Design a protein around this ligand. Structure first.
Ligand SMILES: Fc1ccc([P+](c2ccc(F)cc2)(c2ccc(F)cc2)c2ccc(F)cc2)cc1
Lengths: 102, 102
């Protein structure tokens, strides 16, 4: 399977685990989070062995924001009609335009 | 919060070290570059206490594009055509909308 899909998913899980849980996580040992950080770098290194960095970055930002928006609504219950989402979308549209002219 | 600004600088130091290692020095450990990127993530983790992860991803890319553009050309805002001007305005305006939001 693609390293890139694993790598984006590893960043989403790993970054989500950064601010999550003042008690100790259900299902998951905390050394698993350390392994996940190591796995994320391994997946990234495989990804940027084979995929050009700037081309990859455009895919990566677009997939990552959507994936964590879906996760934010799904697992954390977050609203889709918050004005911050609109602000984020303006940035997402703007970064896409710069990416096409560079 | 100015932590994401620090995370951007930690990204600039680490990215330059990676590019320096690939193109120029033969004698730089991978672990040091990884620690510089981990510093960007620690500064991000402090940010993720205050700014939601999806919002934080979009701001990191857009704030990145302006600083990286300025450093990589050595000046800001030369050779802008009409959609590029709109692209820069959208990035600034979206971040400003998030900045005004609590
Ligand atoms: F929202 C974002 C913000 C940053 C990145 P980042 C990054 C961050 C932390 C890290 F540990 C290693 C790499 C990147 C760029 C293209 C990819 F395929 C995968 C990752 C990156 C590195 C150098 C650079 F100049 C710009 C971005 C990705 C999405």
């Amino acid at each position: 399977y693609i390293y890139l899909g694993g790598a984006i998913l590893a960043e989403v899980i790993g970054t989500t685990l950064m601010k999550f849980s003042e008690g100790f996580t259900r299902l998951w040992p905390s050394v698993g989070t350390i392994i996940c950080y190591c796995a994320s770098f391994w997946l990234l290194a495989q990804t940027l062995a084979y995929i050009p960095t700037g081309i990859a970055y455009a895919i990566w930002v677009g997939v990552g924001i959507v994936l964590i928006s879906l996760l934010s609504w799904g697992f954390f219950g977050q609203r889709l009609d918050l004005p911050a989402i609109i602000g984020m979308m303006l940035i997402c549209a703007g970064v896409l335009i710069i990416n096409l002219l560079s």
